[PDB]
């Protein structure tokens, strides 16, 4: 499948090389190849997958925003719309690819809380990116799909993970962004961010120096958003 003939370990090694070279499209293709080998992913490998696709879709989102703004200013020839649609279609294909990997078959094989929450958070994230550009008869259903994925991830993380766990924190961070930016629920976003921050603060005393650094980094993003939102 382009990558079907390459060893899993070689795909992982090349994903790490691509990251060092800031070649994120390559990195994503290598990690897609590794997933399609059908074995579960380690914690490091899950992070490589996420880094690769987050950087790819990140460029597409940034481009889409530039073009949508130009298109909106033009509405105060068809080229701006056509080109925004091209980028949008490419973004939707990347999101569909990631959602396909999660559905076939990362999530169903993920039994541990750290893997299952990571993947369900990813599912919410890539439906959220779809929701950012959605405008037709599917925007509501896309939003509901993001919410459902995030909610299942939240339920597991609250049962199975400490409040300072960085996956749990990044999940709550992104679900709060979903509430604020997608779901027109800024009060829910603010409440979630506050409660997440305060419950992690009260658990920091249990952590090593390095774990403390990991958790407080994500907590600072919650604080930055609260400052932006209030």
């Amino acid at each position: 499948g382009a990558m079907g003939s390459m060893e899993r370990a070689s795909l992982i090694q090349k994903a790490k090389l691509a990251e060092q070279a800031e070649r994120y499209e390559d990195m994503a293709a290598f990690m897609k190849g590794a997933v399609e080998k059908g074995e579960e992913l380690s914690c490091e490998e899950r992070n490589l997958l996420s880094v690769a696709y987050k950087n790819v879709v990140g460029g597409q989102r940034a481009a889409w925003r530039v073009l949508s703004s130009i298109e909106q200013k033009s509405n105060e020839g068809p080229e701006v719309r056509e080109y925004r649609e091209k980028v949008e279609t490419e973004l939707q294909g990347v999101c569909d690819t990631v959602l396909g990997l999660l559905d076939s078959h990362l999530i169903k094989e993920a039994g541990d809380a750290e893997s299952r929450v990571f993947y369900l958070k990813m599912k919410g994230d890539y439906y959220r990116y779809l929701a950012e550009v959605a405008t037709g008869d599917d925007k509501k259903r896309i939003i509901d799909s993001a919410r459902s994925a995030y909610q299942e991830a939240m339920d597991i993380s609250k049962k199975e993970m400490p409040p300072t766990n960085p996956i749990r924190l990044g999940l709550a961070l992104n679900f709060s962004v979903f509430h604020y930016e997608i779901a027109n629920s800024p009060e829910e976003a603010i409440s979630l961010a506050k409660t997440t921050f305060d419950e992690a603060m009260a658990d920091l005393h249990t952590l090593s120096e390095d774990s403390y650094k990991d958790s407080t980094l994500i907590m600072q993003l919650l604080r930055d958003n609260l400052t932006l939102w209030t």
């Binding site: 992070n47 996420s50 696709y53 950087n55 958070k121 996956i167 990044g170 958003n225 932006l228």
Partner: peptide, 10 residues
Amino acid sequence: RSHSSPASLQ
């Protein structure tokens, strides 16, 4: 405008 999570967590 709102900040979201880094890709890498743990």
